[PDB]
Structure formats: structure tokens, C-alpha cells
């Protein structure tokens, strides 16, 4: 083919491909072939182009549901998915559940959440050093939180985790495998909301079931798909992001010691580490211009698709000083770790709360925390659209 394959390469730990910094400098918007659908997409590497592709009404995610649209993942996007709804229906779909995810209702969770983190750190001191931080904190903590929030039975963790890993496949699985799991996840979630039909609950699944009986603008598929989106995102992001921030802290240990030194640096350290880490391994859900749109170096034509690399916008030397350097004393940090525009993460305040409480708790109660397995053998998850560790053995 004429144009290059994206992703450019199999990923390495949390390392940014050095082609991203080259593209930022000399070819900020470049033709790429995505691993699925047909044709070519524009890859967007710098912050101001990213803010436009994510920000502007001229770009449609709905339009990207066409099976022939380029995408990073094997199944054509599900049309009832939030990510694939354009405003204003997108705005109506997000109000179903938005109430619960406002910064103010998330601040109210801090105590419940800080207890939870204390129990799990109790059970780790009980087991004794070494222990797998994945096993004792990363997985059970966030899984417990969205289970309480959604009203999903904690006893289903092995069930929904397996569905959730399959639906975040890049290469590990095939279209037919994933499409199968989508159907199961749909039918499962449809069943959990169904149980609320006679017995409404003080729950987001509760709210989703209420919405199914009375709403006239949203399909049952949209409302139920909402519950799967929140159950996947609500654990998959935080589970990976706790291993990623711990990996960044302990592999140049000065950082971890800087937070043990001052545990009030932890909210700023979280934002800085959200900026620094390619949690999304490559690309994004795709946006198709509905009209000509001007970017820094090119006019994207109506019908041309675009894809963003969040981690590369977060390294743009024209908005962050010493961008390739980890710094907890940055005066300003306008990162897009949580996206931008209508699809800006609903969970951003929750993911902040969960990461703050996990790191505060560690950095206060375990000053002696060190990686007790070698860097070279670290089990980075492979062939998923997200990055994170399968395990993280730590001593103290
Ligand atoms: C550290 C945690 C998190 C990170 C880094 C993260 C990152 C992101 C990013 C970058 C997007 C935008 C994708 C795009 O527009 O193409 C996004 C969207 C989303 N995130 Fe998060 N997220 C996190 C936590 C959460 C949590 C805790 C939830 C749910 C409880 C969640 C649910 C979502 C949902 C549903 C979307 C799609 C929203 C929409 O289409 O309107 N995320 N997230
Ligand atoms: C399964 C996810 C979906 O649950 C979303 C809402 C969860 C997370 C928080 C996201 O929204 C996430 C940032 C995705 O947009 C990307 C990982 C993208 C490459 O993957 C996706 O586009 C995939 C296929 C989505 O459907
Ligand atoms: Na897409």
C-alpha cells in the first residue's frame, strides 16, 4: 500500500513511539491505514488539531459506524454505543446517568472509597511482602466501586472482566469472537436491568430501567448499552491506570519518594501521570468530517476520517514545557487524558478520585514500596486497545 500502517509498531511498556514527536514537528496531520475497516485516515498528533477533531460539531462519530470506516478494533462500532452518538441525542443519552458523575457527587464518594482502599491495603499487610499489587488493590478497588455505583453483583467480576477484556481487544481476538461477547454482554446487562422492572433500585441500573419504561427519544439498546459502557470503562481504565502510575513512580523511585515526602503533591502527580501515560495504546474512536474542516496543515474534506493519539497531544512541546519529562510542579496541565468535546470522559472525576485515594494511601502507609519483580519480565497486556500490567509484585 502507499501509506503507512497505524499503529506504527507493537507497543513497549508505556513508551511513546518516537515517530510521534517527528510527526508533531514536521507532519502533524498524516495519512495512515488503520488495522480495520477500509481506506485511509488522518492521524492527529498535536494538541490544537486534537482539540478540533474532538471539539467541533463538523466531526461525527455516528458516521464512523459504517463497517467500511477505518477503526482501531476488529468489530464495526456498535451504533447504540455512546461513543457513536452525535449531539443532541448524545446529550440526552449522557443526561440518563450524568447526575451521578458530576465532580460534586464524586467528591461525596471519597469516604466510602477511602474505607474500601483501607480494607484492601489491610488484606495486603495481612498477606505480607512480597504481594501482587494487581491482585490486592488495582483490580478489587475499582471493581468494587463501579459494582456499588451501577448495582452490579461483585460476584460477577470474573464474568464481566472476561467480557470487558474481549471488548477492548485490538489484535488478541477476532471480529467473530468479540461480536459474540458483545451479544452476551448486551444480553447479560439487559437481564440485570430487567431484575429492576418490578424492584426499582437506588442505582444507575435503576435509573437505566426507569428510562426504558418512560423515555421516548432513546432505544432500549442505547440505554442498556450505556450500562455496558460504564461497567467496562469504570473498571478497565482505573485497574490499568493504577498499575501505570505505580510503574512510573517505582521505576525512577525519586518520584515515589517525592510523594512520600509530601502526600499533598498526589492530586498534581495524578494529573501529570495522566498526561504522561499512553493508557490508550494507539489512536481513538474515529471522527468523520461532515464538512470541510481546517486543521494546522490541511483542510480535512467532508467524508474523510480522522483519529487522534491522546498521548501525543499530551506531549505537544507548544503547550507543555519539557513535555518528555515527568514534572509534579507544573503550574498548568491542560492535558486531554480524558478526551475533549462532547465525548469528554463522564468518569473523569471518578477516575481522579480512585487514583488519588489509591496513591495517597500507598504513599502514606508504604514509604518502603519497591518493585520486587524485574522490569525486563513485566507482564504488559498485549493486543488490547488499552495498556497496563497483568501483575505488579511489590515489597515493603
Ligand atoms: C483514569 C480513568 C480514565 C481515563 C484515563 C479515561 C479516558 C477516557 C478518554 C480519553 C475518553 C474519550 C474517548 C473519545 O472521545 O474518543 C473517555 C471516554 C469515556 N470514559 Fe473514560 N477514562 C477514565 C475513567 C473512566 C471511568 C471511571 C468511567 C466510567 C465510570 C469512564 C467512562 C467513559 C465513557 C463511558 C466514555 C465514553 C463517553 C462518551 O462517549 O460520551 N471513564 N475516557
Ligand atoms: C469498549 C470501549 C468503550 O467501552 C469505551 C466507552 C471505554 C473507554 C473508557 C473509552 O471510551 C476509550 C477511551 C475508547 O474510546 C478507546 C479505548 C477506543 C480505542 O476503544 C473503543 O473505541 C472501544 C471499542 C469502546 O467501545
Ligand atoms: Na471508530
Author numbering: 12 to 407
What text comes from the article?
More specifically, OleP catalyzes a regio- and stereospecific reaction of epoxidation at the C8-C8a of the macrolactone ring.
In this position, DEO induces the formation of the helix I cleft, showing the conserved catalytical T248 lining a water channel that might enable proton delivery during OleP catalysis. In the latter conditions, a network of hydrogen bonds that forms between the C3-OH and the C5-OH of DEO and solvent molecules trapped in the small cavity, the solvent cavity, of the active site, constrains the substrate position and bridges its contacts with the enzyme on regions directly involved in the open-to-closed transition. In this analysis, L-O-DEO was docked into the active site of the closed OleP–DEOHS structure using Autodock Vina 1.1.2.
